[PDB]
Design an enzyme around this catalytic site. Structure first.
Site, PDB file in Angstrom:
ATOM      1  N   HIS A 104       1.166  -1.095  -0.195  1.00 55.82           N
ATOM      2  CA  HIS A 104       0.163   0.159   0.041  1.00 55.82           C
ATOM      3  C   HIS A 104       0.756   1.210   0.134  1.00 55.82           C
ATOM      4  O   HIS A 104       2.065   0.520   0.060  1.00 55.82           O
ATOM      5  CB  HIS A 104      -0.951   0.363   0.808  1.00 55.82           C
ATOM      6  CG  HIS A 104      -1.775  -1.207   1.716  1.00 55.82           C
ATOM      7  ND1 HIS A 104      -3.656  -1.086   0.690  1.00 55.82           N
ATOM      8  CD2 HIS A 104      -1.764  -2.546   1.732  1.00 55.82           C
ATOM      9  CE1 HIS A 104      -3.990  -2.247   0.793  1.00 55.82           C
ATOM     10  NE2 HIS A 104      -3.123  -2.947   1.368  1.00 55.82           N
ATOM     11  N   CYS A 118      -5.409   4.626  -3.420  1.00 58.11           N
ATOM     12  CA  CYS A 118      -4.480   3.901  -2.879  1.00 58.11           C
ATOM     13  C   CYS A 118      -3.745   3.417  -4.579  1.00 58.11           C
ATOM     14  O   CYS A 118      -4.410   3.484  -5.564  1.00 58.11           O
ATOM     15  CB  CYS A 118      -4.743   2.642  -2.527  1.00 58.11           C
ATOM     16  SG  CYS A 118      -3.342   1.663  -1.787  1.00 58.11           S
ATOM     17  N   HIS A 123      -4.150  -0.029  -5.726  1.00 58.29           N
ATOM     18  CA  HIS A 123      -5.437  -0.331  -5.717  1.00 58.29           C
ATOM     19  C   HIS A 123      -6.342   1.216  -5.820  1.00 58.29           C
ATOM     20  O   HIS A 123      -7.648   1.299  -5.264  1.00 58.29           O
ATOM     21  CB  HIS A 123      -5.625  -0.755  -4.064  1.00 58.29           C
ATOM     22  CG  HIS A 123      -5.064  -1.967  -3.442  1.00 58.29           C
ATOM     23  ND1 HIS A 123      -4.184  -1.671  -2.116  1.00 58.29           N
ATOM     24  CD2 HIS A 123      -4.844  -3.106  -3.770  1.00 58.29           C
ATOM     25  CE1 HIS A 123      -3.643  -2.709  -2.687  1.00 58.29           C
ATOM     26  NE2 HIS A 123      -3.808  -3.772  -3.537  1.00 58.29           N
ATOM     27  N   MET A 137     -10.535   1.772  -4.381  1.00 61.91           N
ATOM     28  CA  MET A 137      -9.921   2.087  -2.491  1.00 61.91           C
ATOM     29  C   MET A 137      -9.031   2.923  -2.473  1.00 61.91           C
ATOM     30  O   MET A 137      -8.730   3.669  -2.776  1.00 61.91           O
ATOM     31  CB  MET A 137      -8.238   0.860  -2.077  1.00 61.91           C
ATOM     32  CG  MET A 137      -8.117   1.141  -1.302  1.00 61.91           C
ATOM     33  SD  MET A 137      -6.827  -0.059  -0.261  1.00 61.91           S
ATOM     34  CE  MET A 137      -6.481   0.414   1.009  1.00 61.91           C
TER      35      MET A 137
HETATM   36 CU   LIG Z   1      -4.487  -0.480  -0.702  1.00 61.28          CU
END
Ligand SMILES: [Cu+2]
Ligand code: HEC
Lengths: 249, 97
Positions: B39, B82, B85, B90
């Site tokens: 992340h 993100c 993501h 996200m």
């Molecule tokens: Cu993420």
């Protein structure tokens, strides 16, 4: 990411044998896997995975800056095979194998034979060693003794496309239309390459930071021609191996 | 009060939790990695006061545990996402009332 494969495809291996990661990770790079010739029924053995790339070369990251590469893989074992439980790993071996539990995730509940790892830092994991526990055909009807194939899909570096379907910054960008490049603007991003088409119109193609512009202002370009180089440093590769599920004695 | 931003749900779903977050000028907003990593913090943009397009840390913290924390003050609603993501959906928000 392996996560993205799970959402997109129930089965990670296409009929052709192509592994789904390929849809996103366009470039091909080598993948290596080594396993023993044969293994006894409910026994644990090591599968060694390597994903080579030049550590010296940096990749374009999300911000557009250069950074290290991360690696990951999908290891498809035969039916009945699963990652070995910690209890099962013999003493000499435990240190030799990747942290058995943590690194490995099953593709799905039903899919325990398909193991996913990563992303992990490429510099850290030259070799990823999966502790694997073979099935026992006497107990399990579904599996029989015989020779089986194992399929490996291994990737390093950021993918070209997102599950969104939109292209990432680690990809080539092409001229939306033919014409001459009046100007280009820059925050790393070329907010725009402005192209003057054949009949007065002007169009603007936006490229994100990271790719490097091939073209200069005052240059003519054909439609679809590449505005930038291909910044992609990494790639995805596949390799198959076979293992014999042997009968004791 | 001190809050935290979790990246990923128990449902192996890569999303910012809580999807929404509220705080006051002077509060802090931590960030921890749930799962489906890695992340990172890639703000979208904030109104005059702070520098969303600055705090964004592309230091993809592979090692799961707890990225880091940061204090805010500028009043308004902050938005982020993100980097990876991005299509997984996200995104979250942070208010500093
Ligand atoms: Cu993420
Ligand atoms: C829907 C497209 C898509 C699929 C499917 C996908 N990935 Fe990715 N993957 C990406 C993109 C794009 C990135 C880069 C995200 C970012 O950093 O912005 C990425 C990043 C990664 C990374 C981190 C690389 C780095 O250097 O940061 C690894 C490792 C990875 N993917 C492995 C895989 C494997 C293995 C599969 C198949 C089992 C897979 N991915 C399937 C799109 C995909």
């Amino acid at each position: 990411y392996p996560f993205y494969a799970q959402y997109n495809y129930d089965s990670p291996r296409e009929a052709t044998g192509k592994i789904v990661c390929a849809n996103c990770h366009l470039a091909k790079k080598t993948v290596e896997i080594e396993v023993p010739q044969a293994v006894l029924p409910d026994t644990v053995f090591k599968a060694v995975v390597k994903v080579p790339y030049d550590l010296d070369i940096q990749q374009v990251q999300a911000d557009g800056s250069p950074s290290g590469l991360n690696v990951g893989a999908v290891l498809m074992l035969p039916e009945g095979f699963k990652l070995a439980p910690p209890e099962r790993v013999d003493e000499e071996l435990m240190e030799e194998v990747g942290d058995f539990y943590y690194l490995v995730t099953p593709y799905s509940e039903t899919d325990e034979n398909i193991l996913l790892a990563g992303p992990l830092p490429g510099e850290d994991y030259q070799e990823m060693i999966f502790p694997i526990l073979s099935p026992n055909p006497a107990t399990d009807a579904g599996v029989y003794f015989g020779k089986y194939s194992i399929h490996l899909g291994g990737n390093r570096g950021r993918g070209q496309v997102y599950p969104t379907g939109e292209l990432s910054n680690n990809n080539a960008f092409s001229a939306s239309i033919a014409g001459t490049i009046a100007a280009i603007e820059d925050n790393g991003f070329g907010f725009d390459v402005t192209i003057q088409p054949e009949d007065g119109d002007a169009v603007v193609t936006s490229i994100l930071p990271g790719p490097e512009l091939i073209v200069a202002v005052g240059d003519t370009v054909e439609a679809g021609q590449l505005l930038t180089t291909n910044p992609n440093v990494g790639g995805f590769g596949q390799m198959d191996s076979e293992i014999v599920l042997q009968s004791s004695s | 009060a001190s809050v935290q931003i979790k990246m990923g749900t128990d449902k192996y779903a890569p999303l910012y939790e809580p999807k929404a977050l509220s705080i006051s000028a002077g509060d802090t907003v931590e960030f921890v990695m749930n799962k489906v990593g890695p992340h990172n913090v890639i703000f979208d943009k904030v109104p005059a006061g702070e520098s969303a397009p600055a705090l964004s840390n592309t230091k993809l913290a592979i090692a799961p545990g707890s990225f880091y924390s940061v204090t805010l003050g500028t009043p308004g609603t902050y938005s982020f996402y993100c980097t990876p993501h991005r299509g997984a959906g996200m995104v979250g928000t942070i208010t500093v009332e």
